[PDB]
Write a protein that binds this ligand. Sequence first.
Ligand SMILES: NC(=O)c1ccc[n+]([C@@H]2O[C@H](COP(=O)([O-])OP(=O)(O)OC[C@H]3O[C@@H](n4cnc5c(N)ncnc54)[C@H](O)[C@@H]3O)[C@@H](O)[C@H]2O)c1
Ligand SMILES: NC(=O)c1ccc[n+]([C@@H]2O[C@H](COP(=O)([O-])OP(=O)(O)OC[C@H]3O[C@@H](n4cnc5c(N)ncnc54)[C@H](O)[C@@H]3O)[C@@H](O)[C@H]2O)c1
Ligand SMILES: NC(=O)c1ccc[n+]([C@@H]2O[C@H](COP(=O)([O-])OP(=O)(O)OC[C@H]3O[C@@H](n4cnc5c(N)ncnc54)[C@H](O)[C@@H]3O)[C@@H](O)[C@H]2O)c1
Ligand SMILES: NC(=O)c1ccc[n+]([C@@H]2O[C@H](COP(=O)([O-])OP(=O)(O)OC[C@H]3O[C@@H](n4cnc5c(N)ncnc54)[C@H](O)[C@@H]3O)[C@@H](O)[C@H]2O)c1
Lengths: 333, 334, 334, 334
Amino acid sequence: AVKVAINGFGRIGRLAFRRIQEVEGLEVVAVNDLTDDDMLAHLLKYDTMQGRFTGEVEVVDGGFRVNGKEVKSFSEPDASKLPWKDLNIDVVLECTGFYTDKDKAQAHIEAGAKKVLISAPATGDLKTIVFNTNHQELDGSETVVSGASGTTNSLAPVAKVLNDDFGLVEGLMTTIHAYTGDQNTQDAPHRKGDKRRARAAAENIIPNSTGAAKAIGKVIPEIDGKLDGGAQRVPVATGSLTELTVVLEKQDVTVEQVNEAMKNASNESFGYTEDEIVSSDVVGMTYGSLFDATQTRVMSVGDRQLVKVAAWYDNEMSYTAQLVRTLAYLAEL
Amino acid sequence: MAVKVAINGFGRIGRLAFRRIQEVEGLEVVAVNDLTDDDMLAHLLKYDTMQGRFTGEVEVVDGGFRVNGKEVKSFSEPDASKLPWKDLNIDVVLECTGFYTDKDKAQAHIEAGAKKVLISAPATGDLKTIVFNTNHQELDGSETVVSGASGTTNSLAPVAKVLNDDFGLVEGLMTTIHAYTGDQNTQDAPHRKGDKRRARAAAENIIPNSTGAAKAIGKVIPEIDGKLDGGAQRVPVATGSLTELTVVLEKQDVTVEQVNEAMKNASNESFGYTEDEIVSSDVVGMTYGSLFDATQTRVMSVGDRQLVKVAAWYDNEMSYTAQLVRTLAYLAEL
Amino acid sequence: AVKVAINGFGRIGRLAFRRIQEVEGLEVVAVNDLTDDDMLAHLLKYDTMQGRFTGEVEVVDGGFRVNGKEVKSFSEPDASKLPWKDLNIDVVLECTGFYTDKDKAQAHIEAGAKKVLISAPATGDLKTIVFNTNHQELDGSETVVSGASGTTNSLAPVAKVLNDDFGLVEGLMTTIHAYTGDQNTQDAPHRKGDKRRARAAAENIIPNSTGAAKAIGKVIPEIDGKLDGGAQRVPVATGSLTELTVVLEKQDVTVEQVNEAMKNASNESFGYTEDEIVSSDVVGMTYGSLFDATQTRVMSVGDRQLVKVAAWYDNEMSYTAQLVRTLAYLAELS
Amino acid sequence: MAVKVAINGFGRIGRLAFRRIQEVEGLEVVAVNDLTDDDMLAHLLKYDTMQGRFTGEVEVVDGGFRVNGKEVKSFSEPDASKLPWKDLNIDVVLECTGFYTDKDKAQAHIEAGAKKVLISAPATGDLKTIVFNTNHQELDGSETVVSGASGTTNSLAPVAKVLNDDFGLVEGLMTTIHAYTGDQNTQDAPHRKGDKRRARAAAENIIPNSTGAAKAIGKVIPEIDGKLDGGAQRVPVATGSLTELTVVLEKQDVTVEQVNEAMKNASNESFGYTEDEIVSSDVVGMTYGSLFDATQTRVMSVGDRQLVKVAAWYDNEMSYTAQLVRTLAYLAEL
Ligand SMILES: NC(=O)c1ccc[n+]([C@@H]2O[C@H](COP(=O)([O-])OP(=O)(O)OC[C@H]3O[C@@H](n4cnc5c(N)ncnc54)[C@H](O)[C@@H]3O)[C@@H](O)[C@H]2O)c1
Ligand SMILES: NC(=O)c1ccc[n+]([C@@H]2O[C@H](COP(=O)([O-])OP(=O)(O)OC[C@H]3O[C@@H](n4cnc5c(N)ncnc54)[C@H](O)[C@@H]3O)[C@@H](O)[C@H]2O)c1
Ligand SMILES: NC(=O)c1ccc[n+]([C@@H]2O[C@H](COP(=O)([O-])OP(=O)(O)OC[C@H]3O[C@@H](n4cnc5c(N)ncnc54)[C@H](O)[C@@H]3O)[C@@H](O)[C@H]2O)c1
Ligand SMILES: NC(=O)c1ccc[n+]([C@@H]2O[C@H](COP(=O)([O-])OP(=O)(O)OC[C@H]3O[C@@H](n4cnc5c(N)ncnc54)[C@H](O)[C@@H]3O)[C@@H](O)[C@H]2O)c1
């Protein structure tokens, strides 16, 4: 089995862990964060939105035991000092939010790990992977890799069908997105100086930025520079929706043509629905993106068309299933 | 004389219209009709989850309730044709029930004795749909039934009118990220209109939904009739909403600054302008019918081809109410 | 298998349906509500707090097919007119909220059902059953029976231990309780005239009544009249917490004594925990009441003690699991 | 002439203290210290999710910010002993960081040059704990570090005092149903104090928690030292809270009206009284330190033995802050 360390046992780290339980050839041997074992153990076991952890968890000496298997824990905020050589780590899942750079992430490798898969977009000379859109670009020699963002994962397979079947001229996106842990509970100073992320997360529609559309060319180079957009953080604790408005090259585009094109591209990563669902219906789903055929619109004025589509994602679990697929694929090369 | 106003449907809109009318000299609410007792009516005027405590004093009396010493008569008659509007001398009925959104239906208030009816919603039939400071000048004061449009329409109109006038609107799509409203369920249950999405827990979901605001925009700005469409996402804020508009324009080298400057130049009491990074709670209770947020303007350019995106905030409650009351005053005054 | 009809395919009826899928012995053959098949099928399948329904649901002619089994559906608001004789109904789960009286429920019997188990407290000459506290009072000759309430099911086994081991003098209760469907999404008239249920459910701590404590004597007659209290509806969509403050006869009571007595009474209905959980952790649980040992307090001033305890319940699934146990038990007698 | 105030920690309480000080003669905020830039400080004064837009005008300038023409200097120094309080002539520091709640730590502001420190929380050490209008008369103005207690203490004290003075308090237990605060997480995450319950999603849970309000009440009302205890349930409102107290009393034939009348007779600027069926959003921004709700009073009687329960609302933000600023004014004036 591939030996995994999880750095940052936060929302993604912990759900990556739950997910790795359902995956042969992957084993989490170690976990690092900034808290005690009791806390780590407790947060794995109970999850507001994702539900009770099905197995058994107990705090032991080196960390905690999950279903008889011992997971070692650490409390070391500087990664370069983790005992990854001593532990024989194949891959570190980098989930802290603080090592989102090819150069910053290289500290795990100095610590003894063989690879680092970052749970976020990341700066620097590395590949950005959405599984089932461009994971074939990995040859397994890579040491640092980005699993992109929940939003990119929602967007990529939608954008790829649109461009392959119709020719993407240009488009704009808004993600209506669950609030995340980088937002305040109450209006308070925000450490990045962001006046909107400063505000009470569960009491507001909050406009915010996201590089998902700007940087999409890292995943689909042929549409590099053709999309942009941002987010509206809103009071659901998880569950998100990506809206994409586009101009296409193809001329007499109908709703049915778009939907059929989308359905034909469905797989484990890209789902397709025609049910009138809402966000809580995607909590815990493992599709990276779920195309909502009910939300497709075609605006036509003479020969000129604007096409709009929308895809659901559990920004938590959807992203986490994608990340773990990329992990397994990366491990296997 | 002050204009004698009846409010039919003392709901979110009715009650906020009432609070609003207290600050608009020249208008007086003499009567209120709903489906409940005075105690309930008085109580909900005084206390408001999102809009705050009512500033004056409210007390339940015989015919209804007393607000700062002025008596408001109240009724509990679901059939409007049977209200005593002649006897009370009603000049204008604010029609805020959600149940008379048709020119012929709201005609029942006129059969009841009122002189005019201003419907607090889009409305079907042969009547004018008015967004104050965009097309209120189409009123000549002979009208007897008028629609004040919707919150979202009021958010959208002055934005669309600037875009078309300064740049030529080719076409556009809209999403409103919208506070939940009383037409949604508290918990997943049957919905009376059979709407499977409004059926779901309002405060626990991002819920897709329809709105005619972009489709019917041609009622307010006829030169762009047919050029916009879009919908809503109802999300868990109890009030406050945001309209996002994505457009194709005829003018060619459009910049963020051109759009923002064009919007700023059209600002007035109905259409506001901000460059502060605000969020939805910051517009709760504001009186602009639409607040253009210059921090959300994007221009997407690929060769000669551009997509332009803008967004305007609105308190679907208070913004809409301020605009409806301005229309009321203007209508009354003719 | 026992042939079950569900009257009222609401939160409780739908979850009862999901639950019945996990019980050999029982089959839902029919469902009655006020809406179309499409709506029913949709709400079974999708659930905001309780998650997707695991099986497959498809709308067919008579109603819907769940995992190949056909469920007939009706849209008949008057129960006496349902085809219960024709369908051979053994037990009606009465989940509408509108038939909470022995004689009202009696309409299902006139319709051809053999028994009626009401999903709520219920007035009249019948038994009120909390499973594993007093379900042994059933001999199976009963035709109408009440499953009591979420809150009563959370309370009874706590109160029974307290009285049996320590002697209950008196006590007061507050249930801190998820908002339910009879509360309003936005501040509006409430049909029962309740000025607190009238307010926006998801934006307030809201005081409300509950008969759970007053009426506990229907479940545990030896403590009849010794308890009282109410609720505070707060903005969680499901999950609730009952706090009980009591005076006991026994004199030198410790936290450990209370906890150990609770632990010793645990079973499939009454759970016990020492983990620092919160309400989202009990969503979907099947204990009717989960005693939280971390919240036990003993206040002592000289010889005089106040003792406080607290038990969690998913007012939806805890209540439903209890209701389904009572149904199974009732069905199995004669 | 005005008393010169510095606000250490410009958070929920620090900012709302600032707004509140605008309405008080002879207090002036000349300085503000936090851990962020001027832009962030200015912005958060101006916009407030639950308390509404700040009425005056706020602009970022060199030393900090201008509020209605008055310059406020700002600093970003996490170690208080290094702030220029001597240079600025600080009379009183409002200690609102949450990080200096001990007399000896707090003494760092005095080392910095301030004359006095009023801490915006319970505080450890040899100092006075003041709830205004309950025990502020224990101040003689020689004190240099003082605690303004907690939101919950301020809600409780005047209720407890009336109970003891008029009836004789034997003992009691409290639960505060309390809005979530900023030491709670947005999403389930490690919590810095190891609190497994404060670690959970604030706005998605009923969350049991501790509070010393009842335990430490003796610091404010010595004659009832040791006679109360209790805790909290943090729930998903953003502000607004409710204290429930269940007591045993020496007086024997106590009625609901007796208790209520006693409470009414003790009302003042700090202690309000209502008989309206309000809810938590009705107390947002109120300036009563506690608002006694006569509608929630219960008396449980079994033979000669009674349990009495009462309930007081408080805006844990503004109610506390109004009380804090009164104590500040009083302290300044001696
Ligand atoms: N919907 C989503 O939450 C989502 C989706 C996709 C990607 N992500 C990304 O995943 C990463 C984690 O986000 P999250 O929501 O799980 O955040 P989180 O706050 O829940 O988890 C971060 C964890 O990192 C720990 N941490 C911080 N600094 C550390 C350090 N130096 N060493 C060890 N641990 C440290 C924290 O204690 C915390 O438990 C972020 O980069 C985020 O962008 C989040
Ligand atoms: N965001 C908004 O709430 C918003 C904004 C703009 C416009 N509107 C429109 O205004 C109308 C009402 O809006 P609301 O949100 O205040 O709804 P609401 O339910 O709160 O108010 C409707 C009121 O009408 C009463 N009522 C219903 N039928 C009646 C009858 N036959 N006779 C007398 N009273 C009756 C109801 O009891 C209720 O008080 C709807 O048309 C709505 O679309 C709503
Ligand atoms: N936490 C809870 O939701 C809770 C807990 C325990 C018990 N209960 C009790 O169970 C009952 C149902 O509560 P719910 O919360 O599931 O309510 P709900 O509104 O979600 O369900 C009631 C359903 O009955 C239908 N209905 C109303 N009248 C009808 C009629 N005459 N014929 C057929 N269908 C009719 C409605 O369409 C609705 O689907 C109530 O008696 C309630 O007190 C609720
Ligand atoms: N309901 C309430 O919010 C409430 C009620 C009563 C008392 N209090 C008390 O008031 C205090 C602050 O509470 P709050 O809710 O306003 O929290 P907050 O987080 O909103 O405010 C604290 C502020 O102090 C700043 N800060 C932190 N450390 C600092 C440092 N060492 N130097 C300078 N600035 C620093 C933070 O950036 C933050 O802006 C706490 O002691 C709390 O218990 C809060």
